[PDB]
């Protein structure tokens, strides 16, 4: 089995991909259209869905012509010993082919996580933001298991160009993180990590956050820490933080030319969850008063006049 599979959906998913092309064979895209295939996606593995061709937009229109569709998408995806699913919450085709290929790995019994994008442009981004999020949630209260999750909000104001140039990153991350390269780290060690309900039986599996953070004084400041998972460059400088449940530590080698950082902190909680979901919710809210709130002209035709089924007055 690969080290670790990428998979990638919808406008945002695949627009994220772009910037993971030397991962190559690693990579895989999936859309419902075409609308977001660039060149450097032949690099790359890349599937659309039939029936759809690019609408929505609307997830409840989109579900039943995708999911049928599922187990054949399956099976252009190897067994890894790690996932990484990514895609924005505020979509049509990204916000439901994740999610539905999501359960699929759970039902692999496999060890993933997924990064996340609010989108905000709309009450139809942020209605999407919910609905989505409430499936998640939904899938880790069915499958038994914790869906943890990297949030980023489509902050006010900053580019999408800028907001996956930070994803892109964090993912390396964590494809460094399961390079099965570092001293200490076992593979199980890391499924321990991410599925800490199969040892930890009295914790609830819900939707969680991951943290990823370069100082000691950053993952501390992470509320009510559920299972950490450290790597150290200088061994030397390893300390024992914060109170998760979970805690494990690995060493990196220098001599890797992807360790870019002294030291790589992740963090799942999900105590977090309830604010992202605050703000969701009451800007959706703040939207749709004014979306209420505004009044229209009364006609300019009424029924003295005389109108023919063309709508002719003459
Ligand atoms: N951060 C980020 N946000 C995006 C990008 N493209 C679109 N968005 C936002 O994400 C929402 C969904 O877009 P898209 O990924 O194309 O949806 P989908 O393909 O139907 O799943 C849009 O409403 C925008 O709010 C992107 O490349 N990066
Ligand atoms: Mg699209």
Redesign the pocket.
């Known amino acids: 089995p690969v080290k670790v599979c990428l998979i990638f959906?919808?406008?945002?998913?695949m627009?994220?991909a772009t910037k993971l092309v030397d991962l190559g064979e690693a990579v895989h895209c999936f859309?419902t259209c075409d609308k977001?295939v660039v060149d450097v996606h032949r690099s790359v593995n890349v599937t659309l869905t039939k029936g759809t061709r690019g609408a929505?937009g609307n997830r409840k229109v989109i579900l039943p012509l995708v999911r049928p569709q599922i187990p054949a998408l399956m099976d252009t995806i190897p067994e890894a010993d790690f996932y990484i699913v990514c895609?924005?919450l505020?979509?049509?085709?990204?916000?439901v082919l994740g999610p539905l290929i999501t359960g699929q790995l759970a039902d692999r019994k496999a060890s993933f996580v997924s990064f996340v994008?609010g989108?905000?442009?709309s009450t139809d981004?942020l209605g999407n933001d919910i609905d989505t999020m409430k499936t998640l949630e939904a899938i880790a209260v069915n499958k038994h298991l914790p869906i943890v999750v990297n949030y980023?909000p489509?902050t006010q104001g900053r580019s999408?160009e800028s907001?996956?140039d930070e994803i892109a990153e964090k993912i390396r991350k964590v494809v460094l993180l399961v390079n099965q390269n570092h001293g200490r780290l076992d593979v199980h060690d890391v499924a321990n990590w991410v599925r800490f309900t199969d040892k930890h039986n009295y914790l609830i599996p819900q939707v969680c956050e991951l943290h990823i953070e370069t100082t000691r004084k950053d993952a501390e400041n992470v509320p009510e820490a559920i299972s950490q998972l450290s790597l150290y460059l200088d061994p030397s400088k390893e300390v024992a933080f914060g109170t998760p449940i979970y805690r494990k530590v690995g060493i990196m080698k220098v001599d890797d030319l992807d360790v870019t950082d002294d030291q790589i902190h992740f963090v799942i909680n999900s105590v977090g969850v309830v604010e992202i979901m605050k703000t969701i919710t009451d800007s959706k809210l703040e939207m749709t008063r004014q979306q209420s709130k505004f009044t229209q002209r009364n006609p300019i035709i009424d029924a003295d006049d005389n109108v023919d089924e063309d709508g002719m007055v003459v």
């Open positions: 959906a919808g406008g945002t998913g627009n994220v859309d977001n929505g895609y924005s505020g979509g049509g085709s990204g916000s994008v989108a905000m442009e981004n980023v489509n999408y907001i996956n």
